[PDB]
Paper text:
The semaphorins are the largest family of evolutionarily conserved axon guidance cues. The semaphorins signal through their main receptors, plexins, which are single-spanning transmembrane proteins expressed in a variety of cell types, including neurons, cancer cells or endothelial cells. We determined crystal structures of Drosophila Sema1a1–2, Sema1b1–2, Sema2a1–3 and Sema2b1–3 to a 3.6-, 2.8-, 2.1- and 2.5 -Å resolution, respectively. All structures contain the sema domain composed of a seven-bladed β-propeller fold, which is followed by a PSI domain.
The secreted semaphorins Sema2a and Sema2b also contain an Ig-like domain positioned C-terminally to their PSI domains. For example, the Sema2a construct used for crystallization contains eight potential sites for N-linked glycosylation (N95, N163, N190, N229, N314, N401, N563 and N658) and the N-linked glycans were clearly visible and unambiguously fitted into the electron density at N95, N163, N190, N229 (only chain B of the dimer), N314 and N563. Our crystal structures of Drosophila semaphorins revealed that the dimeric architecture in Sema1a, Sema2a and Sema2b is covalently secured by an intermolecular sema-to-sema disulfide bond formed by a cysteine from each of the β4B–β4 C loops of the opposing chains (Cys279 in Sema2a). In the class 2 semaphorins, besides the interchain disulfide bond, dimerization is mediated mainly by the top face of the sema domain using five protruding surface loops, which intertwine with each other to form a massive interface burying a total of 4496 Å2. The Ig-like domain of the class 2 semaphorins is also involved in dimerization and contributes 21% to the total buried surface area of the interface. Remarkably, in the Sema2a structure, an N-linked glycan at residue N314 forms intermolecular interactions with the surface residues of the neighbouring chain. Approximately 17% of the total buried surface area between the two chains of the dimers is contributed by this N-linked glycosylation. The simulations revealed a low inter-domain flexibility that is also obvious from the structural superposition of two independent protein chains observed in Sema2a crystal. The Ig-like domain can reorientate relative to the sema–PSI domains by 14° about a hinge point in the PSI-Ig linker. A superposition of Sema2a1–3 and Sema2b1–3 crystal structures unveiled that Sema2a and Sema2b are also highly similar in structure with an rmsd of 1.1 Å over 608 Cα atoms (for Sema2a chain A and Sema2b chain A).
Author numbering:
A (entry chain A): 30 to 41, 58 to 665
B (entry chain B): 32 to 41, 56 to 664
The structure:
Amino acid sequence: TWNFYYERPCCTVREFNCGKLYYRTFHMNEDRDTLYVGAMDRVFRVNLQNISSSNCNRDVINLEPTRDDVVSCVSKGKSQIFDCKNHVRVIQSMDQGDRLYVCGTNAHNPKDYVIYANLTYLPRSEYVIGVGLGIAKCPYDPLDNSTAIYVENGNPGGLPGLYSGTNAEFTKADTVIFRTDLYNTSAKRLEYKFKRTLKYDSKWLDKPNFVGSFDIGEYVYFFFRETAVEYINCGKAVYSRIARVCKKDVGGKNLLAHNWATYLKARLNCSISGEFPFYFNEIQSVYQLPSDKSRFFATFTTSTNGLIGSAVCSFHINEIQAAFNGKFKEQSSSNSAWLPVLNSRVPEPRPGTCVNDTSNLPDTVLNFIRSHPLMDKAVNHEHNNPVYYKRDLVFTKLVVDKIRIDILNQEYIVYYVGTNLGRIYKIVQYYRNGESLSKLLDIFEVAPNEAIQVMEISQTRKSLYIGTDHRIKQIDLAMCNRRYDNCFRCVRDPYCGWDKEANTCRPYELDLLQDVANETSDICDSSVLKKKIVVTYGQSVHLGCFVKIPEVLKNEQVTWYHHSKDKGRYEIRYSPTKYIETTERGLVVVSVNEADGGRYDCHLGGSLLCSYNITVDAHR
Amino acid sequence: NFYYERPCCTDHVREFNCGKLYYRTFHMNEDRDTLYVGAMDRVFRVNLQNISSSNCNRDVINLEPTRDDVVSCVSKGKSQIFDCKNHVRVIQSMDQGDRLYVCGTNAHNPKDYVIYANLTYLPRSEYVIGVGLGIAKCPYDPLDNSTAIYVENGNPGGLPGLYSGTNAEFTKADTVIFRTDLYNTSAKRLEYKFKRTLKYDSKWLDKPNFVGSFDIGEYVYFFFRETAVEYINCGKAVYSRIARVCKKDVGGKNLLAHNWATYLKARLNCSISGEFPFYFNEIQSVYQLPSDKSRFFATFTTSTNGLIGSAVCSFHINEIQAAFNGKFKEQSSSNSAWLPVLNSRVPEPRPGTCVNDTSNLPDTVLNFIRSHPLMDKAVNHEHNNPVYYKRDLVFTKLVVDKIRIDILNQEYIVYYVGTNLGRIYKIVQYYRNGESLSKLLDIFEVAPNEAIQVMEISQTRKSLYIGTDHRIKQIDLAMCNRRYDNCFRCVRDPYCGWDKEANTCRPYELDLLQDVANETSDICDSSVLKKKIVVTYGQSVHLGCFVKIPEVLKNEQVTWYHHSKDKGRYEIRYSPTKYIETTERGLVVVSVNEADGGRYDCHLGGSLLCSYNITVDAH
Ligand SMILES: *[C@@H]1O[C@H](CO)[C@@H](O[C@@H]2O[C@H](CO)[C@@H](O[C@@H]3O[C@H](CO[C@H]4O[C@H](CO[C@H]5O[C@H](CO)[C@@H](O)[C@H](O)[C@@H]5O[C@H]5O[C@H](CO)[C@@H](O)[C@H](O)[C@@H]5O)[C@@H](O)[C@H](O[C@H]5O[C@H](CO)[C@@H](O)[C@H](O)[C@@H]5O)[C@@H]4O)[C@@H](O)[C@H](O[C@H]4O[C@H](CO)[C@@H](O)[C@H](O)[C@@H]4O)[C@@H]3O)[C@H](O)[C@H]2NC(C)=O)[C@H](O)[C@H]1NC(C)=O
Ligand SMILES: *[C@@H]1O[C@H](CO)[C@@H](O[C@@H]2O[C@H](CO)[C@@H](O[C@@H]3O[C@H](CO[C@H]4O[C@H](CO[C@H]5O[C@H](CO)[C@@H](O)[C@H](O)[C@@H]5O)[C@@H](O)[C@H](O[C@H]5O[C@H](CO)[C@@H](O)[C@H](O)[C@@H]5O)[C@@H]4O)[C@@H](O)[C@H](O[C@H]4O[C@H](CO)[C@@H](O)[C@H](O)[C@@H]4O)[C@@H]3O)[C@H](O)[C@H]2NC(C)=O)[C@H](O)[C@H]1NC(C)=O
Ligand SMILES: *[C@@H]1O[C@H](CO)[C@@H](O[C@@H]2O[C@H](CO)[C@@H](O[C@@H]3O[C@H](CO[C@H]4O[C@H](CO)[C@@H](O)[C@H](O[C@H]5O[C@H](CO)[C@@H](O)[C@H](O)[C@@H]5O)[C@@H]4O)[C@@H](O)[C@H](O[C@H]4O[C@H](CO)[C@@H](O)[C@H](O)[C@@H]4O)[C@@H]3O)[C@H](O)[C@H]2NC(C)=O)[C@H](O)[C@H]1NC(C)=O
Ligand SMILES: *[C@@H]1O[C@H](CO)[C@@H](O[C@@H]2O[C@H](CO)[C@@H](O[C@@H]3O[C@H](CO[C@H]4O[C@H](CO[C@H]5O[C@H](CO)[C@@H](O)[C@H](O)[C@@H]5O)[C@@H](O)[C@H](O)[C@@H]4O)[C@@H](O)[C@H](O[C@H]4O[C@H](CO)[C@@H](O)[C@H](O)[C@@H]4O)[C@@H]3O)[C@H](O)[C@H]2NC(C)=O)[C@H](O)[C@H]1NC(C)=O
Ligand SMILES: *[C@@H]1O[C@H](CO)[C@@H](O[C@@H]2O[C@H](CO)[C@@H](O[C@@H]3O[C@H](CO)[C@@H](O)[C@H](O)[C@@H]3O)[C@H](O)[C@H]2NC(C)=O)[C@H](O)[C@H]1NC(C)=O
Ligand SMILES: *[C@@H]1O[C@H](CO)[C@@H](O[C@@H]2O[C@H](CO)[C@@H](O)[C@H](O)[C@H]2NC(C)=O)[C@H](O)[C@H]1NC(C)=O
Ligand SMILES: *[C@@H]1O[C@H](CO)[C@@H](O[C@@H]2O[C@H](CO)[C@@H](O)[C@H](O)[C@H]2NC(C)=O)[C@H](O)[C@H]1NC(C)=O
Ligand SMILES: *[C@@H]1O[C@H](CO)[C@@H](O[C@@H]2O[C@H](CO)[C@@H](O)[C@H](O)[C@H]2NC(C)=O)[C@H](O)[C@H]1NC(C)=O
Ligand SMILES: *[C@@H]1O[C@H](CO)[C@@H](O[C@@H]2O[C@H](CO)[C@@H](O)[C@H](O)[C@H]2NC(C)=O)[C@H](O)[C@H]1NC(C)=O
Ligand SMILES: *[C@@H]1O[C@H](CO)[C@@H](O)[C@H](O)[C@H]1NC(C)=O
Ligand SMILES: *[C@@H]1O[C@H](CO)[C@@H](O)[C@H](O)[C@H]1NC(C)=O
Ligand SMILES: [Cl-]
Ligand SMILES: [Cl-]
Ligand SMILES: [Cl-]
Ligand SMILES: [Cl-]
């Protein structure tokens, strides 16, 4: 039994673990080398350089509910062990990181806070006006999918405020996209009233699950999936949406003063191209690169039992704005069709555009947008197809990394996509011959049968951070020297390069070998070593390049060759009595004789992978 | 010394090949032991017992288009090699089989014929009135999907007539479901005018592709896929339909006389169950057993480029009639949703029901049905899940067979499903505990990369007949000895039985072993392959039952058990240093020692597949 390469299992890599605390909220602050984690009854300040160095009892603030709040929550039929806890669901930086805004479920009684960055309470004299009640700022239910973002700049009066998407009621009958009251916190006076979507109006929102929100220029964008109201007459479906509000929105003048006057939403299109596209309807997560505010990356799943499938799509801000600039959709009555409105038949100023004072808008614009929140055009995804899609898996969360290779400034986009079963799919995207291409590079086993709940990526520490309900894992982005003991896998990873002279994989450098796009399939040929083995007569010998072949290679074509003086190099054909194929793509040679000696070559995916030289010796 | 799956099937397989003639139309006549085949410019009279015994030049009638018809077709931009040919698309039995009704595309100028059974023309004195022009009876385009059925009984006046679904114009603008003029042949008089769907009305038909038509009781049924008009406001889809007309239909009066007065259609529902069902939207073929008119069997595919799949669904006549007895659908204006009609708004007699003279119907009934052809309820498939479905396959045609082991209590349905790549999937359906189960039994290789165009099954010759554009194949239904060299797969086939004495698979008889429904999982235990191996100490040994594991068994659970003196029977767990799993569900035991001797059992699907006895020789 002979094996060339042993690729180390990944990644059941550092861990932070304080029990099953439902680690579902991340807020990274690289300026303080900290990953803030919201969990059950707790905010942790986790060290970004090495999460294992943090202490469960020191790097924490305990926010457990009062026993009075627990009893009241239990009295309403909720569970003492899980529901009637304070699950932290918002953590946002304030005052240049000196303080944190925190919101938690607080035993189905949402409560929010402002605390110091070191996780201590403000003095009583320093309590921030307008903070305490978390209703509409974060959910009651720890299983909800909500979103929030704290926005310092661009709001009315230049005042900071929280934008949120969550359920605002214990019965879950009031989902809302929300902005808090805006205070002059020094003067202790409320300046701008809160904003909310129209209650009881299924055209604005219908059972949404929120997956992200972003502060970009003059707007705040919200990402969510919801009941597809415009599909009801044809069947049952969930659609994905991006909603947009103007930061300067102050609502209408009198009885519309608390509702958005600029709220618009559009369907998100993630689909396989064709005469009849295959749509992935349910967005699960969205991410934006720190260096690129013009793009969003998102995961989508199907809704059906019979065809489980998931995809990654990206969307450009230009295509989002084209949707919001296109025709509005209209259902003039409950039993009518949904029809486009000619843009020339829309009132002015254009609904959804940021005017100086929405409270001065004509009633005809206010009335229009209240009945036309949905755009007729869907937001097209970049390129013709998803970045990546695959059957029988449920993508959940994702982050994205952008890297440039030094030798010729080649750019690669790397997706880290979590699953409901605790795996990470590592996908690389690149452009060749005018087209967008992607390759699945690796599957990480992070936590068997533990759904990925939250992900973050640090550029200062070159690490991936992954939250499940049981643990946090930290994975180095460049696992070159540890994970790759072979040129084959090394040159396919955009973080790595193969050092032929040293026979090692290293974080990429100019002189190192790399071929992410598979343009030079012989790049590792001179690095393939020939292992010389001695086999006794009649004995069977197991030849394999990997002890366990990486899962992403299991479907590649494998060809074995034997070198003889009479045949030259010829392809080995599997037979029941001589040449057996193993599930790990190995070769078993049965009853080795003199003619079976010599060189064996294993090619995988069109590249020489490993090579053996067999010498046959007597049974001694 | 292993199980070996013999390739199949490029116990016999016969071929009829006269070149690439696009053999796409079958008409089987078992009484005359003949398979009539319609092809390019030709109808063949193929021997049903042995299709290879037929001659390409003797058992054929040449129906090539005239020079003017070719010239006219070529001048319109159509290809002379393929488009401007006479592709036969309808063959039906007439006069107790003494004559055949034939319709061909005739270089985009459809023409029809009545010929003798021996494929010779009638004399001029016998030319049949109303026969000659094939418009609305079979398509212009050889690539069109059309259907037609010649109906002898139940029409007005008791006269025979052709029912068809096809395109009636060269421009393909006018798709029609049609009934020909009904003549009294003896008296040479037209008795009833033709019937057609409402011209250019996209709510009656919208770019349909027809896959079948059936004559049942007082109705003719049509199966087709079409643009989903009731879906247009939500997106772009194709839906599958069953449509129904009363054979007694004579239309309305005045400008309504030439239109159906009983035409209804309903969506066909083939889907995987769930909170969000997965629909297979595009019906490709439909089949009825000769002995059971209460059920329809059909293939469906998806519409997408990515993540494609196909399914087989069955439909019962009780669900079909429930759809046509349900509420009508209605879009009252171009700005209206599609909604059910209140039953109090439905006039009497009920639209779509068969009356003795539809031209005597009240205005309200005729106006209602002409504006409400689509029923609100979809036709639910039996069992609420497909009989079978598979990703990444494109099903085309199918035929179905019914097997009854009658001294036992079992009944089995075997589906033969062709693919666009020349394969046949053989699926068995059976009922246990009242729930429907299915198993993929086999995958025949009929013609690599040649789409299956037409299929027929003969009970008198117990044969499967398959047509592609290049060839015709005839396959014995009982391939028992040729296909299965082992008890394990033999007992799973409803046609076959394992002979314990001769140790061979034979066509099923009483006292042979069979277990299609896996009700006796140890039935083959005494018949499985059993091998004894003497290995030397430290030597490795490869154990395996199959030379190559059959494709259809690649999904089953395989478990290896070891009987040692020190540990009894226990499950072997794979490990790179001791127990190496091999590609064909085998096992390599590495560096055998004394404790590794004994019995090794391989289980597949929970049944013993083969067994090894290892004795270790000390060195
Ligand atoms: C594939 O299968 C098919 C079906 O199985 C095969 O088809 C068979 O093919 C054969 C060969 O062609 C057919 O046989 C032949 O039939 C014809 C027609 O027969 C009928 O008409 C005859 C002529 O009638 C006129 O003339 C007589 C006599 O002068 C006169 O009394 C009549 O009144 C009539 O005259 C008038 O009408 C004319 C217009 O019709 C006017 O122009 C004219 O001026 C007058 O006004 C008639 O004699 C004949 O009668 C016979 O048959 C009937 C029953 O059908 C019977 O009742 C009678 O007593 C007679 O027995 C028919 O009414 C015929 O003309 C052919 O004759 C030649 O061949 C025979 C030998 O077979 C010789 O004896 C003759 O002298 C003559 O040379 C021949 O009989 C057959 O009908 C047909 N079968 C079917 C069911 O269609 C086909 O062959 C297969 N193909 C292959 C490749 O294998
Ligand atoms: C083909 O066969 C398959 C298998 O046999 C079959 O599958 C079932 O498919 C359904 C989905 O279609 C699965 O789910 C159920 O769906 C029921 C229907 O729900 C929808 O339709 C409602 C009615 O709409 C009609 O009326 C309007 C009027 O304006 C019209 O436009 C429409 O076109 C249509 O004609 C619609 O109201 C409803 O929307 C409301 O409710 C949802 C949430 O329920 C909400 O989000 C919306 O905002 C809106 O308020 C929806 O669009 C549904 O009734 C059913 O729910 C009951 O049963 C479940 C248990 O399954 C309970 O949990 C629930 O509380 C309800 O009591 C359920 O949701 C169903 O599971 C499949 N069944 C199987 C066995 O797989 C297909 O339907 C067949 N297809 C066809 C075309 O026939
Ligand atoms: C999400 O993002 C994806 C990818 O970016 C978008 O994908 C595009 O989707 C459309 C479908 O929505 C694909 O098809 C197009 O369909 C339209 C409309 O088609 C229908 O209406 C026609 C007019 O009424 C009718 O003629 C059509 O019927 C014919 O074709 C169908 C099959 O297509 C067939 O079944 C019929 O028998 C007819 O033969 C059909 O009912 C159509 O107008 C488009 O194109 C025509 O014109 C262009 C310009 O010349 C030509 O290039 C086309 O070939 C066609 O002739 C087109 O067919 C379209 O292919 C998808 N595009 C890609 C790149 O994949 C998707 O729309 C987005 N969704 C949303 C909600 O935004
Ligand atoms: C915020 O977003 C998240 C992410 O999208 C939402 O999370 C999803 O929530 C739903 C509903 O809560 C979850 O579904 C449930 O999972 C429960 C646990 O799973 C078991 O079964 C798994 C396998 O499933 C089996 O059944 C199917 C059915 O055909 C078979 O095909 C399959 O082969 C299996 O046999 C096991 O792997 C697992 O170990 C568990 O054993 C289920 O119990 C649950 O079903 C129950 O509830 C149904 C109604 O919800 C009811 O119909 C059933 O009868 C049963 O009572 C259901 O399947 C998703 O798993 C979860 N996704 C992720 C990624 O976490 C979340 O809901 C959302 N928040 C809000 C507030 O909406
Ligand atoms: C009648 O039904 C058949 C079967 O459903 C239809 O055939 C399908 O037709 C499409 C369109 O021509 C074929 O797709 C094409 O594939 C080729 C390459 O394979 C590509 O170059 C084309 O652009 C197109 O994508 C499809 O293969 C074919 N399927 C089979 C099984 O033949 C046919 O179109 C129907 N007839 C009419 C008139 O619609
Ligand atoms: C990350 O921090 C943890 C905890 O400080 C380190 O783990 C300890 O390392 C010391 C020194 O090697 C050992 O004596 C302890 O036994 C380790 N503890 C555990 C729980 O393993 C870890 O080495 C640090 N990782 C890096 C890369 O610095
Ligand atoms: C947590 O942070 C707060 C605020 O930064 C710290 O409080 C201050 O502590 C410094 C150091 O003694 C004083 O000079 C300031 O006057 C304090 N300000 C206030 C408002 O109290 C606090 O000491 C930190 N706590 C821990 C444990 O690190
Ligand atoms: C079916 O018909 C074919 C064709 O007549 C038969 O095959 C021929 O068999 C003879 C006798 O061995 C050969 O000389 C010919 O060369 C064969 N023809 C071809 C085209 O190969 C076949 O035996 C028949 N099968 C039966 C009767 O079961
Ligand atoms: C075929 O039938 C056998 C016998 O009932 C099935 O085996 C049983 O499976 C259940 C559930 O997995 C086990 O609890 C029993 O111990 C099994 N019995 C034996 C004797 O193995 C088997 O699963 C069936 N196979 C298929 C594919 O349905
Ligand atoms: C890499 O390229 C070779 C030939 O250039 C090809 O045979 C092989 O399939 C490719 N592998 C992958 C993973 O694309
Ligand atoms: C056709 O008409 C003739 C006489 O006109 C008659 O004998 C025959 O029965 C009619 N056929 C039918 C089917 O009614
Ligand atoms: Cl939590
Ligand atoms: Cl416009
Ligand atoms: Cl076999
Ligand atoms: Cl043809």
